[PDB]
Write a protein that binds this DNA or RNA. Structure first.
Ligand code: MG
Ligand code: ZN
Ligand code: ZN
Lengths: 99, 82, 1342, 83
DNA sequence: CCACCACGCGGGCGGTAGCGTGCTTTTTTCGATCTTCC
DNA sequence: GGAAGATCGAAAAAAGCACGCTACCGCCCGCGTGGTGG
RNA sequence: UGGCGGUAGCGU
């Protein structure tokens, strides 16, 4: 099973799962721990946002790679926004303090 | 309320026995001269005034055009209450 | 863009401000036309348009109308993505309490209102009236009244008091209180009160009130009045391609809430009776509670097919929640999965990759290169060319992956070695080809294993994977520093066969001019590979200045070793390959090559070793045949004699001479001895039974048997496996765990009958079940360990601390488990190392101890070294590089920014699979020759001149002639000594003896013994002996002691010829040896005794993964050993009824220590002894909290490290102490105040240790006196949960409680950590990104 | 090609800023249209930057010096063009 | 005139009752002594 | 000598129970009520 | 081409 780009989930904006669905391999918690053990920061960040959830990041990455430029825009993962919306729906305020 | 079933006092029963009300009932309020929203037909999403029940199948409203409102009777299922 | 996250409860007004509309109908989507209804759960007007830049009515359907709303239907023409952000709101008819703030223990509402949770539960669901206005009547403010009580109060008082129901009454009570006066009164009461539990309750209530008043939140906001509604896209109705839609549980719960609210509004509009209104309000409250968190109270709402519904809180917590399923880990693009095979031709930094799989993975790169080359002008043309698979596409594929590393990962990623960077090589096939050497790193077997591949797609990731995670850069295990890339199965066997000498091999005795001639002779088939010859070879030695000098000489060796000498680099000497070269020999050679030559030649040497081993193992053609396992000729004689002995023992037992247990033990021992003899005979017949005819006569040499060659070389198997091959299988254990009388006397070469196979299946089944049910425990333990130390990174260089651990080699019994060398290597010293007896600076204060320093210190016979430890690192919010030590994976000191905590957690958790969960002396022996030292000893001479100790913690050390402590033992109190201190003794001699069954009372004075202060039948009894019949006194306990004799405590007084009690020499009061319970005294009245005589007789698994979990979680031993809090004498107070009261009376200080001790618990100390701080008073394990409180941080750290190391060594796994020290430091992160001082911390507050240290330092700099703190040992789960960053605690587990705490307290979370940065999606503060973060920090300086 | 980067690591001396400086050089070469100071043999930008770092031609301090000199040259040129 | 294609308000399901039921660890509460005094 | 703090064991409630991957099955409100076609 | 619940299997 191999995937470069394809359909994404309609709720979490993440790649699908399973060979029959042409999904992508899951990067579990232990993989993240191993990456942090190596000191992997840029690789982990590019595996977390610009590859899975950041729609604008994914489009920018695709355009840059087609154009021959290897640069990453971290953007903002949509899973965190979904979690914030769910927490807000629970009657509990959560927000990002810029200051 | 709690483990045991609730016991209603006889005063409430006495009040309910002589309870002879008159109410409008909110969701069934296509009263004459009342605001009603039509969401189907040629006048979908338009606010009009129910003014008389024409028969049973097709109640009668002052359907609102861009210029003014005109007497017209259309199906009951077309419009809901505002 | 942002710096921190603010978490708090939402006010109803601001909740309304959040919403773009109000949902008033339960309808979601009309089935006739796929459009939402007005004011529905999916209404376009409230949330947004269903299509991009398209009005719902259709009047405006172009981008030119963006930003304006329609008038036909009232929807805004914007993007569809706005439906993912806009939220709805429902106006509840009556206020409803929040389930999270009410049921999550401790109840926030109940604790705030100071009333039991049961009363809150009753009043909330319309069961008991609660008062709000106390008035002038007897009713107070908050009183619980039932319906009858409420009616009686109403009849007695009219309108003087107000009582209400439901959540409205709770809201009124919350709104009608003042926080300032309440907290002031609570503080005053806490100052005035003295009860410890009352003090703790008042302190926690004061803390809650202070946290509430500090933030802008108000108590009345805790009762919900406006209910938020999730955006529709977060609860989508996926089409079912059958005319129906799949409604999510959230939609159903929202429909229930809407229907109940509408029903309540209609009922209250009609002036319904009190009972009906109360029932409807209770139903609405139940529906709201179910929606917010289903199953918390009562019965959970069932689904369509009888399952609990998924509520809002159900998708936040748990493994399937958003935190642990879509935030910590997520599916990624540019990834693939395939099975793995073995490629022998690949290099250490190369891995095979299928052509089609690589084409699928590298599609965007191929598209870009094709566009650049001009072959295609659009994306569609490039896609068509790629799918058509032209030759130019393959050329582009080859070009784009020339030097593009890929990340290969395995599913059970235990440690960091589970994912590694490899250079891809295109192959035709369908399986990934893996390097054989890295397999041990991956723990992967080519038996169906599947591995995943990820493609980094940016310059930073590519360079960072090339430099950090490349396979060539990972040759040392971070857990212990031992090499990982080593020959495992075939290379070791091939090299062992190559470097083996025969006796009369072809071409023996010839003289060769060099390795080239030897190779050309072997290839030509003119001399055997095992022939012993003499070859002239030149070897290069590394000079001191850093140069290579070539020395040529003739060596007597074999042809195989001469051939192997080709691939050995210049620097290595020839002595490494002039042996049998087993697996450990190969590993030692590789380690030496890495140490001397470096890293660049090491990979080439490893590749050449693997190639040569594979080639010569193929050439040798070793095979296993049925004739290889030889059955000993003497086996049947041993079996027959053992059976005869067992039969004669059984027939002796039949006569009744020996009982069942003794005969069973004898049979077991006889069978074990027979099995050992058979195994030894088989090993002797297999090792060197090869007789070869040397020129002139026969000779004996090491056997060339395939099994023996394959096992001795260490390629596969071990001694036990070979014993199972040819010798008897031995005894086996039944399911309970006991040994079976009849062992399996059949080999695997021969057949086994049904009974033996059935017996043997038990162990295999037990092992398989243990592994299957142990994988989960290991995973949970490693997850907890990773979370506990996920925010510990090196962020300093040197704290200047002069405190360190007193590291010494560990001694346990008659063997040295671990010397000082391995336990100190790769660590820095806490202070100067002094040569023994010369007071000379052997090692400087802050010099890292490498191999040379280790040799220098071991040459001086030093044993005690004070070394800086992570637990003693003075740096706050991280540790320094110097206080940590060696990187343990590189030759240099650890670099700044590394994540030491994750390294430690992975290293500790990786051996979880190897562990197990199965649950199943009277003299001192001397082994070596050396002198004897005694520590913590107060000894006196006995009647015969022997030495008897009066100290309970006496330790004897057997020290060699070089002054190094060789052996250590703990001699029990009152043990006779055969020899004195400072006398050299030989092995096998006994120095001390004692009675373990019962202890005798030791007398330190000489004189007469009388029968005083005791009366027969009241305190003691003159019982006749069963056999001798002598009248011996037995002391009755307090339960059977008479009331009159309660104050008459028995006590034997040693008297002189005068008759009065003899005072202790140098001590004021006389020697009154107390008589404890069950004391047996044989001597009669007025018996003359000397010092050291015996007075009275007193009568007298936890291993594997559960032991590690208990040690880490600080679990109570369930039978703690009582320790003396303060140093002083011991006295007995009132006996009470169940527990004895012991009073500690220091000679100089006061006596505030009174301790309750259970009666059934044995007391080690008597009434008239002297004890110090942290002294054992009762038998049993020592609780870690007690050790930390009494003996300090160093002692508890040493105890935990020693226990963990012993547990791991029992299983044969070695782990460095740095990881355990890091974990222990993470354990000790909380301090509780004792004296408030000038600081604002409360007396009972428990806060972070770093904050206390910073506050104390600031106060000292200002000049004001600081506060006093005591460190607290909290379990790893509690330590992880109780952290400053609430995001990590929420992601860990117990999300409801931590989220409620954060919402109530209004906490502000700065990231300053790894897990929260990962969740947000920014660069982690560990490793490379750390540098960037540092820059950001300095940008916040100005 | 670069099988190992141990000598480059000891040249940088910390193993973490080496990744940053190599990435900066690679980004400068790939999209900035820069000319490498080390001859290339059909090699990627990343390994080319690593090989440049090998001989000490590229380092954080000298790279910053070159960046500042280029910035001052371009600002002087634009000031002359404007004036 | 009978089978079968919507449909739109409720909620545990079904029944003149009862259904549940082979884990361990941690935290909270509560009756019962107790015990200790003012 | 009765009331409040101690405590103490005994009982009750809450949370967790590894990671990836593959394949199949079943369902995607049920039910009293209503109108319409074979 | 979306989810779950159950079952079975693979690698540990
Ligand atoms: Mg396998
Ligand atoms: Zn419109
Ligand atoms: Zn330090």
């Amino acid at each position: 099973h191999a995937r470069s780009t394809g359909s994404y989930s309609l709720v979490t904006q993440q790649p699908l799962g399973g060979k029959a669905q042409f999904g992508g391999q899951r990067f579990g918690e232990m993989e993240v721990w191993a990456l942090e053990a190596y000191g992997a920061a840029y690789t982990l960040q590019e595996m977390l946002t610009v590859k899975s959830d950041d729609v604008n990041g994914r489009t920018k990455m695709y355009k840059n790679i087609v154009d021959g430029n290897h640069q990453m825009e971290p953007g903002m993962p949509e899973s965190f926004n979904v979690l914030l919306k769910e927490i807000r729906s629970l009657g509990i305020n959560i927000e990002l303090e810029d200051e | 309320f709690g483990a045991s079933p609730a016991i209603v006092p006889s005063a409430v029963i006495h009040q309910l026995s002589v309870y002879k009300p008159k109410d409008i009932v909110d969701p069934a309020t296509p009263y004459p001269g009342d605001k009603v929203i039509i969401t189907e037909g040629a006048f979908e999403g338009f606010q009009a005034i129910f003014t008389e029940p024409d028969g049973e199948a097709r109640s009668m409203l002052l359907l609102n055009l861009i210029n003014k409102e005109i007497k017209h009777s259309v199906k009951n299922t077309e419009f809901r209450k505002l | 863009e942002f710096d921190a996250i603010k978490i708090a409860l939402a006010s109803p007004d601001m909740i309304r401000s959040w919403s773009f509309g109000e949902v008033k109908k339960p309808e979601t989507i009309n089935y006739r036309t796929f459009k939402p209804e007005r004011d529905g759960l999916f209404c376009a007007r409230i949330f947004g348009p269903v299509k991009d830049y398209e009005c719902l009515c259709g009047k405006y359907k172009r981008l030119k109308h963006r930003g304006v709303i329609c008038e036909k239907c009232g929807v805004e023409v914007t993007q569809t993505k706005v439906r993912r952000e806009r939220m709805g709101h429902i106006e509840l008819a009556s206020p409803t309490a929040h389930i999270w703030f009410l049921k999550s223990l401790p109840s926030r509402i109940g604790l705030l209102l100071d009333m039991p949770l049961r009363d809150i539960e009753r009043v909330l669901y319309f069961e008991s009236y609660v008062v709000i206005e106390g008035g002038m009547t007897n009713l107070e403010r908050q009183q619980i009244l039932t319906e009858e009580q409420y009616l009686d109060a109403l009849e007695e008082f009219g309108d003087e008091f107000d009582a209400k129901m439901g959540a409205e009454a709770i809201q009124a009570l919350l709104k009608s209180m003042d926080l300032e006066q309440e907290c002031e009164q609570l503080r005053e009461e806490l100052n005035e009160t003295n009860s410890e539990t009352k003090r703790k309750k008042l302190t926690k209530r004061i803390k809650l009130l202070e946290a509430f008043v500090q933030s802008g939140n108000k108590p009345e906001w805790m009762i919900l009045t406006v209910l938020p509604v999730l955006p529709p896209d977060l609860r989508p109705l996926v089409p079912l391609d059958g005319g129906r839609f799949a409604t999510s549980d959230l939609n159903d719960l929202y429909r229930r809430v809407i229907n109940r609210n509408n029903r309540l509004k209609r009922l209250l509009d009609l002036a319904a009776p009190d009972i009906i209104v109360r029932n409807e309000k209770r139903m609405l409250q139940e529906a709201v509670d179910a929606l917010l968190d289903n199953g918390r109270r009562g019965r959970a709402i069932t689904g369509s097919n009888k399952r609990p519904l998924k509520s809002l809180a159900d998708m936040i917590k748990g493994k399937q929640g958003r935190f642990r399923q879509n935030l910590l880990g997520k599916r990624v693009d540019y990834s693939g999965r395939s099975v793995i095979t073995v490629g022998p031709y690949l290099r250490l930094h190369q891995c095979g990759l299928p052509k089609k799989m690589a084409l699928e993975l590298f599609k965007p790169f191929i598209y870009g290169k094709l566009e650049l080359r001009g072959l295609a002008t659009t994306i569609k043309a490039a896609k068509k060319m790629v799918e058509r698979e032209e030759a130019v596409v393959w050329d582009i594929l080859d070009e784009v992956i020339r030097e593009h590393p890929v990340l290969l990962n395995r599913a059970p990623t235990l440690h960091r070695l589970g994912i590694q960077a490899f250079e891809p090589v295109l192959i035709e096939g369908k399986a990934i080809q893996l390097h054989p050497l890295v397999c041990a790193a991956y723990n992967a077997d080519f038996d169906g294993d599947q591995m995943a591949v990820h493609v980094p797609l940016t310059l930073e990731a590519q360079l960072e994977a090339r430099a950090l995670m490349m396979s060539t850069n990972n040759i040392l295990s971070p857990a212990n520093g031992e090499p990982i890339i080593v020959p495992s199965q075939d290379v070791v066997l091939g090299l062992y066969y190559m470097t083996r000498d025969c006796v009369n091999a072809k071409g023996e005795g010839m003289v060769l001019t060099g390795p080239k001639e030897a190779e050309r002779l072997y290839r030509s088939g003119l001399a055997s590979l095992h022939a012993r010859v003499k070859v002239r070879i030149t070897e290069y030695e590394k000079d001191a200045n850093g140069e290579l000098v070539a020395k040529t000489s003739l060596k007597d060796t074999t042809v195989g070793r001469a051939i192997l000498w080709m691939i050995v680099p210049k620097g290595l000497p020839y002595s490494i390959v002039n042996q049998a070269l087993g697996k450990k020999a190969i590993s030692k050679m590789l380690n030496t090559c890495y140490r001397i030559l470096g890293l660049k030649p090491t990979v080439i040497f490893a590749d050449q070793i693997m190639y040569t081993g594979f080639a010569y193992a193929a050439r040798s053609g070793a095979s296993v045949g049925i004739d290889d396992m030889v059955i000993p000729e003497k086996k049947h004689e041993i079996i027959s004699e053992a059976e005869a002995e067992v039969a004669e023992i059984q027939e002796q037992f039949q006569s009744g001479l020996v009982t069942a247990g003794e005969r069973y033990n004898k049979v077991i021992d006889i069978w074990a001895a027979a099995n050992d003899r058979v195994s030894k005979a088989m090993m002797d017949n297999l090792q060197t039974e090869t007789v070869i005819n040397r020129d002139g006569q026969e000779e004996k040499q090491v056997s060339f048997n395939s099994i023996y060659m394959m096992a001795d070389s260490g390629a596969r198997g071990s001694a036990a496996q070979i014993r199972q091959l040819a010798g008897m299988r031995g005894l086996m254990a039944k399911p309970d765990g006991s040994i079976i009388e009849t062992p399996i006397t059949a080999n695997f070469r021969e057949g086994l009958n049904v009974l033996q196979y059935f017996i043997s299946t038990h162990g295999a089944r037990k092992g398989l079940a243990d592994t299957a049910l142990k994988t989960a425990n290991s995973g949970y333990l490693t997850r907890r360990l990773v979370d506990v130390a996920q925010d510990l990174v090196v962020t300093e260089d040197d704290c200047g601390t002069h405190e360190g651990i007193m590291m010494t080699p560990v001694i346990e019994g008659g063997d040295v488990k671990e010397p000082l060398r391995d336990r100190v290597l790769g660590r820095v010293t806490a202070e100067d190392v002094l040569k023994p007896g010369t007071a000379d600076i052997l090692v400087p204060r802050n010099t890292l101890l490498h191999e040379q320093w280790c040799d220098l210190l071991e040459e001086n016979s030093v044993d005690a070294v004070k070394v800086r430890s992570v637990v003693s690192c003075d740096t706050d919010f991280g540790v320094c590089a110097h206080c940590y030590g060696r990187d343990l994976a590189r030759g240099h000191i650890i670099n700044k920014g590394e994540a030491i905590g994750v390294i430690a957690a992975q290293s500790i958790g990786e051996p979880g699979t190897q562990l197990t969960m199965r649950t199943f002396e009277s003299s001192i022996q001397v082994k070596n020759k050396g002198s004897i030292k005694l520590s913590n000893v107060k000894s006196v001479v006995n009647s015969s001149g022997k030495l008897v100790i009066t100290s309970r913690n006496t330790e004897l050390k057997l020290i060699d002639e070089f002054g190094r402590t060789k052996e250590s033992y703990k001699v029990p109190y009152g043990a006779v000594l055969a020899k004195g201190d400072g006398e050299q003794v030989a092995g096998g001699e006994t120095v001390a003896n004692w009675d373990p069954h019962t202890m005798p009372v030791i007398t330190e004075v000489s004189g007469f013994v009388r029968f005083t202060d005791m009366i027969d039948g009241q305190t003691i009894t003159r019982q006749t002996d069963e056999l001798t019949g002598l009248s011996s006194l037995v002391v009755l306990d307090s339960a059977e002691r008479t009331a009159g004799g309660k104050d008459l405590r028995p006590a034997l007084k040693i008297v002189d010829a005068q008759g009065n009690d003899v005072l202790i020499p140098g001590t004021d009061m006389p020697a009154q040896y107390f008589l404890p319970g069950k004391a047996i005294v044989q001597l009669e009245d007025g018996v003359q005794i000397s010092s050291g005589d015996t007075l009275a007789r007193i009568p007298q698994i936890t291993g594997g993964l559960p032991r590690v979990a208990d040690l880490f979680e600080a679990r109570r031993p369930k039978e703690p050993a009582i320790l003396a809090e303060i140093s002083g004498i011991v006295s007995f107070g009132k006996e009470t009824k169940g527990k004895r009261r012991l009073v500690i009376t220091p000679v100089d200080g006061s006596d505030p220590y009174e301790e309750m001790i259970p009666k059934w618990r044995q007391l080690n100390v008597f009434e008239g002894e002297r004890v110090e701080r942290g002294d054992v008073i009762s038998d049993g394990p020592e609780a870690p909290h007690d050790i930390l409180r009494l003996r300090g941080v160093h002692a508890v750290t040493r105890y935990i490290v020693n226990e963990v190391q012993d547990v791991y060594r029992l299983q044969g796994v070695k782990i460095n102490d740095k990881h355990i020290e890091v974990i222990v430091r993470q354990m000790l992160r909380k301090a509780t105040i004792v004296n408030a001082g000038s600081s604002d911390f409360l007396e009972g507050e428990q806060v972070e240790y770093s904050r206390v240290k910073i506050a104390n330092r600031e106060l000292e700099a200002n000049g004001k006196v600081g506060a006093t703190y005591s460190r607290d040992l909290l379990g790893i789960t509690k330590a992880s949960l109780a952290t400053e960053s609430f995001i990590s605690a929420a992601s860990f587990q117990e999300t409801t409680r931590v989220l409620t705490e954060a919402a109530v307290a209004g906490k502000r979370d700065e990231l300053r950590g790894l897990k929260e940065n990962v969740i947000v999606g920014r660069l982690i503060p560990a490793g490379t990104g750390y540098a960037y973060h540092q820059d950001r920090m300095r940008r916040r300086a100005a | 090609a670069r099988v190992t980067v141990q000598d480059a690591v000891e040249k940088i001396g910390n193993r973490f800023d080496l990744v940053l400086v190599a990435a900066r050089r690679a980004r400068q070469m790939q999209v900035g249209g820069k000319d490498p100071l080390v001859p290339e043999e059909n090699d990627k930008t990343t390994v080319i930057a690593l090989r440049e770092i090998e001989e000490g031609l590229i380092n954080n301090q000298i790279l910053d010096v070159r960046e500042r000199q280029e910035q001052q040259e371009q600002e002087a040129a634009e000031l002359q063009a404007v004036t």
